[PDB]
Design a protein around this nucleic acid. Structure first.
Ligand SMILES: [Mg+2]
Ligand SMILES: [Zn+2]
Lengths: 402, 157, 1340, 50
DNA sequence: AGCAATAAAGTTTCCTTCCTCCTTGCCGATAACGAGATCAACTTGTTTGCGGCG
C-alpha cells in the first residue's frame, strides 16, 4: 500500500516468491536449449534454497536479508513465539466499549458502588441513549439525537441518570493473578475525571493509591450482566477459595480507631459510676463529660438463641470501658458480650467477623463491617493522631552496651 | 534491470544529475544553489523539480519496529480513507423507499423508469427507447420528482 | 557577596571547613569535541589522526598518488536561531589541502612527473553549542557517552562446564581494538586448543608450525631439558635438587659413592638440601628409569636418516640400545612434575595431526575458507591479513599498554600488530596460572572498564567514509589519464555525510533532550551506559554487573538508577568525578602527611586506591594537628576498617563526593531509607515549573551552581549599566575599562518569550533587574522558566499538618484546601504545535485558499482572505485553521449518491479540501504562525506580510543598533569641528549637517573635513552592506523535499489547573494521589483562626522511614515566624537598628557554622530590600551530612516563641471543637508532576479498526481500544461465565456481522446476542495450507 | 499488473471482458451490458480472499 | 392548468486521428586487470535428545 508522499510499504513474502519464479523461468529457458548440466544443477540448488528459505529462512542455510542486514521474514513467525496469532492476536484481544482512568478513593460509599466521571460514562452508553431519544420522540431520528447530544442538554443528564441505575460494570487492575483481580460494581456518577474506589479492596487488587490505573468493561448483554451481578459482585467475593479466610481485613486505620477507643486507662475521670445503657455514653461523651477509655460499670442486654434457632433475651451488668458499651449498640442481636472485653487486635476482628458470618448468615456481617468502617474512621478523625521527633524513644541503656 | 521496476531514462537522468552536481560542486566548492542545476542542466526547473519526486524516493517495508525498544511496529500506526460506515447506507436505503414513496403518485413509466434504473441498477434510456417520446417529458417529470423530494428534511449534507 | 546575592541570602548550618568550590560541571563534552576538531600537529587526535592514519593513496599499479597536507573549516552560513527556526542542522564547512604527486614509472622514482597542489571542499560537519547539544533539522538533541571493556588481554576459568567432571578449565582471550579476537583454551584431558572469532577448536601447536617453528625449538622454549647421558653402558642423569620435591624415589637414589634416598622413599626437603649441598648433578641411575620417558628431540641414525623415535615419543630400552649405539650419549627429555610441570604441550602435540608447515596453512585455510581450492598464496594472504595487516587489525596502544602490563614488560607502547614473542608469552602465562602461579581477575572492577566519547565515534564513522572513497579512488588512479585528471575530479562527498547524518540521527545513543527542568538536562548529559555497539544487552546480561562494586566510591552515585529492567546498568557520574586521559576514571583526594591533611589534591585512579589508605571526612580533625581520634575509619582493598592516625596516606575532601547532584539536594538524607531516596531523586527531575517561581527554604548549597550552569538565563557577559529595558529585550552599555577599543561595546539581549519545549511546555525569560543600575560581570539579568535570583525554583512551599480525616487519606492520598486554586499558583501551560503542507500532486498542485464549498461562514469569519487565521483567537475542536485544497480526478458513482446529489444539488468541484483543523478534545489560544516556501515559487501573500514585518523587526533592531552606535560617533563628528575655532551657538542652532563650511582654517583641517566625509561614507556603506546581506538571507527561500509546495505551521497555548487525580510528592519518596479539595470552612484551624492548606496520612512514615521530612517540617514552621516577626515590624514601621540587630542575631545563632557576615557593611536600602524579600520567610542551607541539629532546630523555634516540639492545638472547621492531641505542623516544599488526569484518560465506544485482522487498535492518539489478556480469561473461567467470553471475543473484537447487528439491536432496545466465527481463525488455516497442508474441518 | 503477484489478471482473467468503446472491463461489473452500445457479456467470477 | 413547437446551449460520446512520446525487445568491436571474505557477532543458559563415540 502507498504512503502520504506516494511511498510504499510491503510484505517481504513477495520478494521471496519473485526469486523462485525467476529461477524457475530461467530453468525452463535453459531446458529449451538442452544446455550443459552444471548450470542446471546450480539452478536447482538455488531453487530449493529459495524454496525452503521462503518457508523458514535461517534454519538450514544462513538467512537472507534486505539491505538493512535484517531477515526477510518467512511464514512460520506468523504462528510462533509471542508474535504469533495464538499469543498475540487470537487469545489476547483489543476491545471497544472499554476504557480506563486513574483512580482514587470513596470512603463513604457502599461496597457495591463505584465512582464514574461524567463524560466517559456519557460516551459509553451512547446507543442506549439514542434508542430512548427515539423512544421519547425527542430524537425522532438519529441525527437529532447526535446533535442534541453534542449540545449536551439537561435532558441528556436526566436520561443518563435514568439508564445507569441498576446498570453494573466491570473493573480491572493489571496484572490478573487470581480471579479477584477484577470485580463487578454498580455505578455512581461523579464530577471529575478520576474514579473513586471503596478502600477495602486495595488488597484483592494489590492496589496502592500512588498513581495506578484501571480499566473498565461492560456486560452489554444481559446474561453477562446478571452473572456479574450474581458472581463477581463485591458480596460473593469475600473469602479465598485457596484457604477459607476473610479477605476483608481492615488494614491499618480503622483498626487504630477501634484499638484507641476500645481501651482501658485509669487516669482521666468519672471512674466507677452507673448507667442504663450505651445511649448515655453517647449522651455524655458527645457533651464530652467522660473518658471513653475508662472501665466503669453499666448495664447491657445480651441475646442468644440456645433454643432451636430462636432468641433468648437477658441482661446484666458489666465493669467495662465506655467504648465497649457503645460498640454494643451496633452488634446484631446474636452475640455474647465477651466479644468486646479486650482492646481488639486485628485477629480479634478477624474472628469477630468469622463468627459473625458462620452463625448469623451473610448480610448482617456485611452491614456490620460497613459500620465498623464508618465509625472507626469517624473516631479516628476524632482521635487526634500524629507523631513527632519526640515520640522517637532512645533507651539510655544502649551506649554502655556498645 | 529485471529486479528493478522503475524506468531507464529515469536513471539516465539520475546518473546525469549525479555527474553534474558533483562536477559543479567541485567547480564551486559548496552546495545547494539549485538555480545552478537549472543552469547547467538548462532544460527547465519544473523538469528536475518533478524528477526529484520521480527518482529520489524509494520503497520501504512494513514491519520495521518503532524505535526505543520495540514498542510497536509501523503496522499499528496506519490509517485508511475508504472505510465502512453503517448509517449512510442505512439512510440511503431509507431514501430509496422514500423515492418510491414520492413517485408512486406520478406517471406510470417514470415511476418504473426511476425505480428500475435506481433500484436494481439497470438502464435509463432503455426506457426512452421504449416510449419513443424523445425524453423531454422525462426531463420535466424528473425535475418534478426533485421538486417533490425538496419538500422534506434530511441531514448527512 | 555579589549584587544578586545581596538581593536574597540563604542561611547555612554546615560546619566543616570547605576547601573546594565545585568545578565547571559539564566540561567533558566540550573538551571531547574541542580536541576532536582541533588541529593537532603531532600528538594526533581524531581528524588529523585519521588522515595521518590513512596517509596517502596510490594506484592499483603504484604509479600515481594523492597526498594529504592539511585542512581547514569555514564558518556557518546561518546563525543558531535561524537554523532552529528554518528547520535545519547547524553545521560548518570543511576545507582540505591536497597535493597530487606522480611518479615516473620509467624512472626508478622520477618523482617530478606531475604536481597538482590545490584545495578541496568536501562536506560540512555539525558543531556544538556552548551548552552541549547539536541541533538537527531544527531539533535539539544529545548523544550519550558510553562505557565498555578495554581492548587487550583477558584471563578466566570456567568451573565444571561438563559438570560431570566438576573441574576447572582455564582459558585466555585477546581482543584487539580493531581486528579479530582470539581464544586459547584447555580441555578435560589437559590439552591446549585455540579458536579465532570462536572458530571450531584446533590444536594450538599447528599455528606454531604455521609460524615456521619446529618441535625442537618449541619445547626448547616451553620445556627445560631433562638430560640423561649414556656413559658406555649405564644411565647416568643430570638432576637439579629441586626437581625431586614432594616426590618419591623409583630405585636406590644415591650418589656415585653415597646414598641419599632409599627405595620407596620420599625425596624430602632434607635430601634436596644434601643434593644441592654436596655438589652433585650427575647420578648413576637404572636404565629402566627411561622406559616411559619421552624423547625431547627427533633423534636419528646420522648414517641412515631414520627416526628411530619420532620426537615427542615415549622411550624404552630397545630404543635405549639403538639410540645409545647410534652415537647419542646424551638424551634430552621432558620434565614432568605433573604437580607443577605437566607436559600439556607434548600431549596436545601427539593429539595433533600435522608436521609440515605448508599443509598446516592449507588446513587452516580449509577450515577458514571451506570448499575453496587450496591455493598457497591465498592461505598465506588470509593469515597475514587476520593479524599482520595494518588494514584490518589494530590495538589502540592502550591495548598495547594494558597488555604489556599484563605481560609485565616495561615498554608501554609498541605497534598495533602482534609479535611472536608476545604470543609465546601469553601461552606461558596461561600455562603458569594453569599450574597455579597467579590468578584470573574480575569485570566489575572499574579499572578494567574504559569510557568512550563523542569524538571517537566521529573518528570512526569519518574514516569509514574515507575508506568508501579509497575504493574508487584506487580504481581510477591506475587507469585514467594523469595529466588531466584533477585531484578533485574523482571524488564524492555523499557517503561521508551519510554516516555522519546517520548516527547523528540513527544511533540508539543520540536522543532528544529532556527540556522539562534544568536538572533533567544536566543529568541526562551526565548519564552513563554500557549499551549500544561494543556493549551489552538486558536479557543476556545478569546481576553481577547490575550490583555494587567498592571501586564505585567517589566516581559513581549509587542512588540514582531506575526501576525498569535496566536497574543497575546505567548509573550517573559522581560529582567530583573526572576521567583519565585514556578513558578511565579518577577522583580527587586530600593527602594526609605527618597526620596533617595537606591541602593539595590528587585525582587518583580506580586502581591506585587499592594500595593505599584513605581517611573519611566525617572524622573530626584536630585543628591544624591531625585526626583527633585514634581508630579512624579508613578504607582500602575494597573494604573499610579502623586504623591509627600517623598511619594514613590520604583523605577524601568532602562528605558528598559519592553522591549525584540529583541525590545531593534533598537535605537530611542522613535519616532515611535508601530505595526511597532513589525514588525521590528519580521523580525529582520529572517535575513541572509553575507559572511563577517560588523558592524553597531548606537547601543544601548547590542550587545556584545549577541555576547558572544550565545556561538558560541572561548573564552579565561584561559589566556595565542598564541602558534600555523592556518586557522583550535589553540593552546594556559596557564599562569603559572592559570596553576594549575597536567596538563601541554595547551588548544587547533579545529574549525568548512564549516558546515551546520538546515536552510541550511554556518557555520564557524575565528580568529580575532594574534600570539605571551598575552591573558586575557574570551576574544574571533575567530569570529562566523555573528559578529566582539565581536559585532553583521548581516547586512551592506550603502548609501541612497530619492526621486522619474521614478516609480521604486512606493510603497516602492527599487532601487540601481550595484557596490555592484561587491563586492558580500551581497552574501551568502546555504549548501545542500543528502544521499543514501544500504538495504538488501527479495531476497538479495542492492549493491553499480561504474559498471552499459547502462551508458555513462561521468558520471563515476567523480566517483572512488567503484562508488563514487571525492571531489572538480562541478556538476549539472542529474548528478549521488552513483552507487547503486538492485538485482531484473523478469517480464512477452509482444511484445512491447520484440521488443524494439530485436532492441536495450542491455541485462537486474538481477539488476537495485538505484543511487543517482542531483535533477533538482540544481548545486554546493561537499566538503565532510561521510559513516556509521554496526558492522558485511565489511566496503566498501572508507569508510575504510576515517576511515584511520580520524585515520591519530586523531593520528596526539593526536601525536601533547602528543609530545608537553612530550616535556615539556623532559625538566626535560634532566635537572635532570645535577643534579649530568657535561657533558657540551658531554651531548649534542652524541645522547640524551644515557645519562643515563653518569657520574654516587651512593647514591640517581640510583633511579633517575629508576625514569627516570619509567616515560618513564608511558608515553609510556599512549600512547598505548590512541591509543587503541580511535582507537577502531573510528573503532567501527554503530547501524542501520533493513534491512540496509550501508549509504552514501553527502554535497553541492551553493552561492546566488541578482536578483530583493529579499526582504530587516531595523529596523523600512521599508520593501521593489527590482525592478531594476542601472548602476552607471545614478545614482544621487554630487558636488564631488560620486554617491549614494540606493534610496527610502518617501511617506510612515508619513503614517507609522517610523521617527527614519531619525535620524539615519543624523548620517548615520555624523560619516563617521570623519573616512574620519582621513583617509585623514592617507594617509597624519600627526602626532600622531593630532590623539590624534582629537580623544579625538571626545569622548569629549557631555554634560553629562557617559563614560569618556583617551588615554595618551594607547600606540602608540594602536592608530595606533585603527585609522586604525576607518577609515571606528566612531560607537556609542544610548540607547533607554536615547538617544542622535538634538543638538548633529547637533553638530557632524557641526564639520563634512556640511549642518546642511544634505540635499544637487545633479545632475542626466542620464543627469547631478541639481534637484530642496536639499535632505537629509546618511547611513542606513540594511539587507537581506530568502524570496528569487529562494526559491519561481515554474512553472508546466504537470507531476505527485494524485491516489485516479488523479488530481494534490501541492508543488514545488513534482512538484506541483496550486489551484483554489471557489472565483475564483464566479468572473468568475460574468463575465459569461463558457468554461473557463469547461476546468479548466475537463481537467486541472480530465478528463484524456481530458488531453490526448488535449495534442494531441495542438502538432498537434489544439486548440480545448472535455469534459467528472470527476471521482471525481462518487466517491461520489459510497460512497452514500455504505451508503445503490439507488442514480442513469435519462438518457436523 | 497482470501475470503478477497482485495479479489483476486473476481478478480479471484476460482473453476477457472488454466492451467496444472500453467502458466496462476487468470483471468490475459482471452483470453489465454496456448500455450505449448495448453489448451483452458473460463469464466472470470473483474472490478477493482466495 | 396540460400539451407541443422552435430555437438555443450544453453536452457526453466517441471516435478518429495524426501528431508525439514512450516503452519492449534485440544486438555490438581495440586489450586485460582477479576465486569472495569486508564489516558484523559477542559468546545467555540450563535442560534435554540424539549422534556419535568409545
Ligand atoms: Mg501502585
Ligand atoms: Zn462499450
Amino acid at each position: 500500500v502507498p504512503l502520504d508522499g506516494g511511498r510504499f510499504a510491503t510484505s517481504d513474502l513477495n520478494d521471496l516468491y519473485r526469486r523462485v519464479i525467476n529461477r524457475n523461468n530461467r530453468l525452463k529457458r535453459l531446458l529449451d536449449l538442452a544446455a550443459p548440466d552444471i548450470i542446471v544443477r546450480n539452478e536447482k540448488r538455488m531453487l530449493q534454497e529459495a524454496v525452503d528459505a521462503l518457508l523458514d529462512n535461517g534454519r538450514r542455510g544462513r538467512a537472507i536479508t534486505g539491505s538493512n542486514k535484517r531477515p526477510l521474514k518467512s511464514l512460520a513467525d506468523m504462528i510462533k513465539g509471542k508474535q504469533g496469532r495464538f499469543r498475540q492476536n487470537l487469545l489476547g484481544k483489543r476491545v471497544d466499549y472499554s476504557g480506563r482512568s486513574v483512580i482514587t478513593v470513596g470512603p463513604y460509599l457502599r461496597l457495591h458502588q463505584c465512582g464514574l466521571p461524567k463524560k466517559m460514562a456519557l460516551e459509553l452508553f451512547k446507543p442506549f441513549i439514542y434508542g430512548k431519544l427515539e423512544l421519547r420522540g425527542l430524537a425522532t431520528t438519529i441525527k437529532a439525537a447526535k446533535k442534541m447530544v453534542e449540545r449536551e442538554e439537561a435532558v441528556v443528564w436526566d436520561i443518563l441518570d435514568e439508564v445507569i441505575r441498576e446498570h453494573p460494570v466491570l473493573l480491572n487492575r493489571a496484572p490478573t493473578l487470581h480471579r479477584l483481580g477484577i470485580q463487578a460494581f454498580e455505578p455512581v456518577l461523579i464530577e471529575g475525571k478520576a474514579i473513586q474506589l471503596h478502600p477495602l479492596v486495595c488488597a484483592a487488587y494489590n492496589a496502592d493509591f500512588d498513581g495506578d490505573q484501571m480499566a473498565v468493561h461492560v456486560p452489554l448483554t444481559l446474561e453477562a450482566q446478571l452473572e456479574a451481578r450474581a458472581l463477581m459482585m463485591s458480596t460473593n467475593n469475600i473469602l479465598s477459595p485457596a484457604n477459607g479466610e476473610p479477605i476483608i481485613v481492615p488494614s491499618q486505620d480503622v483498626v487504630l480507631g477501634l484499638y484507641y477507643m476500645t481501651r482501658d486507662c485509669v487516669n482521666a475521670k468519672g471512674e466507677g459510676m452507673v448507667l442504663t445503657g450505651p445511649k448515655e455514653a453517647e449522651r455524655l461523651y458527645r457533651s464530652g463529660l467522660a473518658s471513653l477509655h475508662a472501665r466503669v460499670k453499666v448495664r447491657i442486654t445480651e441475646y442468644e438463641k440456645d433454643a432451636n434457632g430462636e432468641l433468648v433475651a437477658k441482661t446484666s451488668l458489666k465493669d467495662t470501658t465506655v467504648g465497649r458499651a457503645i460498640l454494643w449498640m451496633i452488634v446484631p442481636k446474636g452475640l455474647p458480650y465477651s466479644i468486646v472485653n479486650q482492646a481488639l487486635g486485628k485477629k480479634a476482628i478477624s474472628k469477630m467477623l468469622n463468627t459473625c458470618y458462620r452463625i448469623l448468615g451473610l448480610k448482617p456481617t456485611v452491614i456490620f463491617a460497613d459500620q465498623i468502617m464508618y465509625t472507626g474512621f469517624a473516631y479516628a478523625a476524632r482521635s487526634g493522631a500524629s507523631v513527632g521527633i519526640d515520640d522517637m524513644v532512645i533507651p539510655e541503656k544502649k551506649h554502655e552496651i556498645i | 534491470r529485471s529486479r528493478d521496476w522503475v524506468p531507464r531514462s529515469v536513471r539516465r537522468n539520475a546518473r546525469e544529475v549525479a555527474q553534474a552536481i558533483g562536477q559543479l560542486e567541485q567547480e564551486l566548492g559548496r552546495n545547494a544553489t539549485e538555480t545552478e542545476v537549472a543552469e547547467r542542466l538548462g532544460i527547465d526547473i519544473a523538469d528536475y523539480r518533478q524528477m526529484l519526486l520521480d527518482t529520489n524516493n524509494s520503497q520501504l517495508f512494513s514491519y520495521d519496529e518503532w524505535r526505543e525498544e520495540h514498542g510497536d511496529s509501523i503496522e499499528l500506526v496506519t490509517d485508511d480513507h475508504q472505510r465502512e460506515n453503517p448509517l449512510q447506507q442505512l439512510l440511503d436505503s431509507n431514501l430509496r423507499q422514500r423515492v418510491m414513496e414520492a413517485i408512486e403518485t406520478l406517471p406510470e413509466r417514470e415511476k418504473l423508469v426511476l425505480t428500475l434504473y435506481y433500484q436494481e441498477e439497470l438502464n435509463l434510456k432503455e426506457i426512452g427507447a421504449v416510449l419513443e417520446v424523445g425524453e423531454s417529458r422525462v426531463s420535466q417529470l424528473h425535475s418534478q420528482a426533485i421538486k417533490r423530494l425538496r419538500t422534506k428534511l434530511g441531514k448527512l449534507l | 557577596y555579589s549584587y544578586t546575592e545581596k538581593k536574597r541570602i540563604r542561611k547555612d548550618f554546615g560546619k566543616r571547613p570547605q576547601v573546594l568550590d565545585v568545578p565547571y560541571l559539564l566540561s567533558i563534552q566540550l573538551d571531547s569535541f574541542q580536541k576532536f576538531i582541533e588541529q593537532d600537529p603531532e600528538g594526533q587526535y581524531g581528524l588529523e589522526a585519521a588522515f595521518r592514519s590513512v596517509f596517502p593513496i596510490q594506484s592499483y599499479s603504484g604509479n600515481s598518488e594523492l597526498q594529504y597536507v592539511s585542512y581547514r573549516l569555514g564558518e556557518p552560513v546561518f546563525d543558531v536561531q535561524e537554523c532552529q527556526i528554518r528547520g535545519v542542522t547547524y553545521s560548518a564547512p570543511l576545507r582540505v589541502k591536497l597535493r597530487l604527486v606522480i611518479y615516473e614509472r620509467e624512472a626508478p622514482e622520477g618523482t617530478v612527473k606531475d604536481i597538482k597542489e590545490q584545495e578541496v571542499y568536501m562536506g560540512e560537519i555539525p558543531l556544538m553549542t556552548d551548552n552541549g547539544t547539536f541541533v538537527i533539522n531544527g531539533t535539539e538533541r544529545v548523544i550519550v557517552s558510553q562505557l565498555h571493556r578495554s581492548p587487550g588481554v583477558f584471563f578466566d576459568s570456567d568451573k565444571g562446564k561438563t559438570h560431570s567432571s566438576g573441574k576447572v578449565l582455564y582459558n585466555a582471550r585477546i581482543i584487539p581494538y580493531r581486528g579479530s579476537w582470539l581464544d586459547f583454551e584447555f580441555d578435560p584431558k589437559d590439552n591446549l586448543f585455540v579458536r579465532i572469532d570462536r572458530r571450531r577448536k584446533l590444536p594450538a601447536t599447528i599455528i606454531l608450525r604455521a609460524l615456521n617453528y619446529t618441535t625442537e625449538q618449541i619445547l626448547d622454549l616451553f620445556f627445560e631439558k631433562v638430560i640423561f647421558e649414556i656413559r658406555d653402558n649405564k644411565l647416568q642423569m643430570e638432576l637439579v635438587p629441586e626437581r625431586l620435591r614432594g616426590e618419591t624415589a623409583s630405585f636406590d637414589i644415591e650418589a656415585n659413592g653415597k646414598v641419599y634416598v632409599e627405595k620407596g622413599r620420599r625425596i624430602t626437603a632434607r635430601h634436596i638440601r644434601q643434593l644441592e649441598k654436596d655438589d652433585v648433578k650427575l647420578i648413576e641411575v637404572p636404565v629402566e628409569y627411561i622406559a616411559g620417558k619421552v624423547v625431547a628431540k627427533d633423534y636419528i641414525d646420522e648414517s641412515t636418516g631414520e627416526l628411530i623415535c619420532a620426537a615427542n615419543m615415549e622411550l624404552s630400552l630397545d630404543l635405549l640400545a639403538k639410540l645409545s649405539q647410534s652415537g647419542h650419549k646424551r638424551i634430552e627429555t621432558l620434565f614432568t612434575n605433573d604437580l607443577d610441570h605437566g607436559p600439556y604441550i607434548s600431549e596436545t602435540l601427539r593429539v595433533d595431526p600435522t608436521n609440515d608447515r605448508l599443509s598446516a596453512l592449507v588446513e587452516i585455510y580449509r577450515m577458514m575458507r571451506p570448499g575453496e581450492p587450496p591455493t598457497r598464496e591465498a592461505a598465506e594472504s588470509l593469515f597475514e591479513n587476520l593479524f599482520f595487516s595494518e588494514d584490518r587489525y589494530d590495538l589502540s596502544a592502550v591495548g598495547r599498554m594494558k597488555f604489556n602490563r599484563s605481560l609485565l614488560r616495561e615498554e608501554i607502547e609498541g605497534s598495533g600488530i602482534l609479535s611472536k614473542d608476545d604470543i609465546i608469552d601469553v601461552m606461558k602465562k596461561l600455562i603458569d596460572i594453569r599450574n597455579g602461579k597467579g590468578e584470573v581477575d574480575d569485570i566489575d572492577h572499574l579499572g578494567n572498564r574504559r569510557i568512550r566519547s563523542v569524538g571517537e565515534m566521529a573518528e570512526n564513522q569519518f574514516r569509514v567514509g574515507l575508506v568508501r572513497v579509497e575504493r574508487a579512488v584506487k580504481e581510477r588512479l591506475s587507469l585514467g589519464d594523469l595529466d588531466t585528471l584533477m585531484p578533485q575530479d574523482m571524488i564524492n562527498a555523499k557517503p561521508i555525510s551519510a554516516a555522519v547524518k546517520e548516527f547523528f540521527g540513527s544511533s540508539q545513543l543520540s536522543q532528544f533532550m529532556d527540556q522539562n527542568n534544568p536538572l533533567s538536562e544536566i543529568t541526562h548529559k551526565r548519564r552513563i551506559s554500557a549499551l549500544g555497539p561494543g556493549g551489552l544487552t538486558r536479557e543476556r546480561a545478569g546481576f553481577e554487573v547490575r550490583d555494587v562494586h567498592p571501586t564505585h566510591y567517589g566516581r559513581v552515585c549509587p542512588i540514582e538508577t531506575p526501576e525498569g529492567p535496566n536497574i543497575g546498568l546505567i548509573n550517573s557520574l559522581s560529582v567530583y568525578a573526572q576521567t583519565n586521559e585514556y578513558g578511565f576514571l579518577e577522583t580527587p583526594y586530600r593527602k594526609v602527611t605527618d597526620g596533617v591533611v595537606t591541602d593539595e589534591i590528587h585525582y587518583l585512579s580506580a586502581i591506585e586506591e587499592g594500595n593505599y589508605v584513605i581517611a573519611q571526612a566525617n572524622s573530626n580533625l584536630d585543628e591544624e594537628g591531625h585526626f583527633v581520634e585514634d581508630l579512624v575509619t579508613c578504607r582500602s582493598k575494597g573494604e573499610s576498617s579502623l586504623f591509627s592516625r600517623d598511619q594514613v596516606d590520604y583523605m577524601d575532601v568532602s562528605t558528598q563526593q559519592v553522591v549525584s547532584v540529583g541525590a545531593s539536594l534533598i537535605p537530611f538524607l542522613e535519616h532515611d531509607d535508601a530505595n526511597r531516596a532513589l525514588m525521590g531523586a528519580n521523580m525529582q527531575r520529572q517535575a513541572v515549573p509553575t507559572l511563577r517561581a517560588d523558592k524553597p527554604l531548606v537547601g543544601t548549597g548547590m542550587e545556584r551552581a545549577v541555576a547558572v550552569d544550565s545556561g538558560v538565563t541572561a548573564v552579565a557577559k561584561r559589566g556595565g549599566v542598564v541602558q534600555y529595558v523592556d518586557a522583550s529585550r535589553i540593552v546594556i552599555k559596557v564599562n569603559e575599562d572592559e570596553m576594549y577599543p575597536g567596538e563601541a561595546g554595547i551588548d544587547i539581549y533579545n529574549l525568548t518569550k512564549y516558546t515551546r519545549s520538546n515536552q510541550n511546555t511554556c518557555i520564557n525569560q524575565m528580568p529580575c533587574v532594574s534600570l539605571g543600575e551598575p552591573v558586575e560581570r557574570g551576574d544574571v539579568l533575567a530569570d529562566g522558566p523555573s528559578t529566582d535570583l539565581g536559585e532553583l525554583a521548581l516547586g512551592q512551599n506550603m502548609r501541612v499538618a497530619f492526621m486522619p480525616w474521614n478516609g480521604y487519606n486512606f493510603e497516602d492520598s492527599i487532601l487540601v484546601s481550595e484557596r490555592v486554586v484561587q491563586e492558580d499558583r500551581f497552574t501551568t501551560i502546555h504549548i501545542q504545535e500543528l502544521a499543514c503542507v501544500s504538495r504538488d500532486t501527479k495531476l497538479g498542485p495542492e492549493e491553499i485558499t480561504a474559498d471552499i464549498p459547502n462551508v458555513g461562514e462561521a468558520a471563515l469569519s476567523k480566517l483572512d482572505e488567503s484562508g488563514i487565521v487571525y492571531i489572538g483567537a480562541e478556538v476549539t475542536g472542529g474548528d478549521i485553521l488552513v483552507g487547503k485544497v486538492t485538485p482531484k480526478g473523478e469517480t464512477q458513482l452509482t444511484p445512491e449518491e447520484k440521488l443524494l446529489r439530485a436532492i441536495f444539488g450542491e455541485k462537486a468541484s474538481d477539488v476537495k479540501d485538505s484543511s487543517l483543523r482542531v483535533p477533538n478534545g482540544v481548545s486554546g489560544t493561537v499566538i503565532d504562525v510561521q510559513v516556509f516556501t521554496r526558492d522558485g515559487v511565489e511566496k503566498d501573500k501572508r507569508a510575504l506580510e510576515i517576511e515584511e514585518m520580520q524585515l520591519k523587526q530586523a531593520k528596526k533592531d539593526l536601525s536601533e543598533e547602528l543609530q545608537i552606535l553612530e550616535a556615539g560617533l556623532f559625538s566626535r563628528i560634532r566635537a572635532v569641528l570645535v577643534a579649530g575655532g568657535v561657533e558657540a551657538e551658531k554651531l548649534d542652532k542652524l541645522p547640524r549637517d551644515r557645519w562643515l563650511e563653518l569657520g574654516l582654517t587651512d593647514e591640517e583641517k581640510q583633511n579633517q573635513l575629508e576625514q569627516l566625509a570619509e567616515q560618513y561614507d564608511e558608515l553609510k556603506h556599512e549600512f547598505e552592506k548590512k541591509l543587503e546581506a541580511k535582507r537577502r538571507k531573510i528573503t532567501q527561500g527554503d530547501d524542501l523535499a520533493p513534491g512540496v509546495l509550501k508549509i504552514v505551521k501553527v502554535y497553541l497555548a492551553v493552561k492546566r489547573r488541578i482536578q483530583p487525580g493529579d499526582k504530587m510528592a516531595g523529596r523523600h519518596g512521599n508520593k501521593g494521589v489527590i482525592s478531594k479539595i476542601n472548602p476552607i470552612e471545614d478545614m482544621p484551624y487554630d487558636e488564631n483562626g488560620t486554617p491549614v492548606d494540606i493534610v496527610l496520612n502518617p501511617l506510612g512514615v515508619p513503614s517507609r522511614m522517610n523521617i527527614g521530612q519531619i525535620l524539615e517540617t519543624h523548620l517548615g514552621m520555624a523560619a516563617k515566624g521570623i519573616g512574620d516577626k519582621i513583617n509585623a515590624m514592617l507594617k509597624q514601621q519600627q526602626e532600622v537598628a531593630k532590623l539590624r540587630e534582629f537580623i544579625q542575631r538571626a545569622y548569629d545563632l549557631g555554634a560553629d557554622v562557617r559563614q560569618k557576615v556583617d551588615l554595618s557593611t551594607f547600606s540602608d536600602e540594602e536592608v530595606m530590600r533585603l527585609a522586604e524579600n525576607l518577609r515571606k520567610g528566612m531560607p537556609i542551607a542544610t548540607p547533607v551530612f554536615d547538617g544542622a541539629k535538634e538543638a538548633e532546630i529547637k533553638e530557632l523555634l524557641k526564639l520563634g516563641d512556640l511549642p518546642t516540639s511544634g505540635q499544637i492545638r487545633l479545632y475542626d472547621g466542620r464543627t469547631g471543637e478541639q481534637f484530642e492531641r496536639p499535632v505537629t505542623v509546618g511547611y513542606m516544599y513540594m511539587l507537581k508532576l506530568n502524570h496528569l488526569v487529562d494526559d491519561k484518560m481515554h474512553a472508546r465506544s466504537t470507531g476505527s479498526y485494524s485491516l489485516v485482522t479488523q479488530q481494534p487498535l490501541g492508543g488514545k492518539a488513534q482512538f484506541g481500544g483496550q486489551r484483554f489478556g489471557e489472565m483475564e480469561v483464566w479468572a473468568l473461567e475460574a468463575y465459569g461465565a461463558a457468554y461473557t467470553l463469547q461476546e468479548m471475543l466475537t463481537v467486541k473484537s472480530d465478528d463484524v456481522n456481530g458488531r453490526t447487528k448488535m449495534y442494531k439491536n441495542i438502538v432498537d432496545g434489544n439486548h440480545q446476542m448472535e455469534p459467528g466465527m472470527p476471521e482471525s481463525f481462518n487466517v491461520l488455516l489459510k497460512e497452514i495450507r500455504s505451508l503445503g497442508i490439507n488442514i480442513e474441518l469435519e462438518d457436523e | 499488473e497482470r501475470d503478477g503477484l497482485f495479479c489483476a489478471r486473476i481478478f480479471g482473467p484476460v482473453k476477457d471482458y472488454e466492451c467496444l468503446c472500453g467502458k466496462y472491463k476487468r470483471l468490475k461489473h459482471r452483470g453489465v451490458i454496456c448500455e450505449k452500445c448495448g453489448v451483452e457479456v458473460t463469464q466472470t467470477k470473483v474472490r478477493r480472499e482466495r
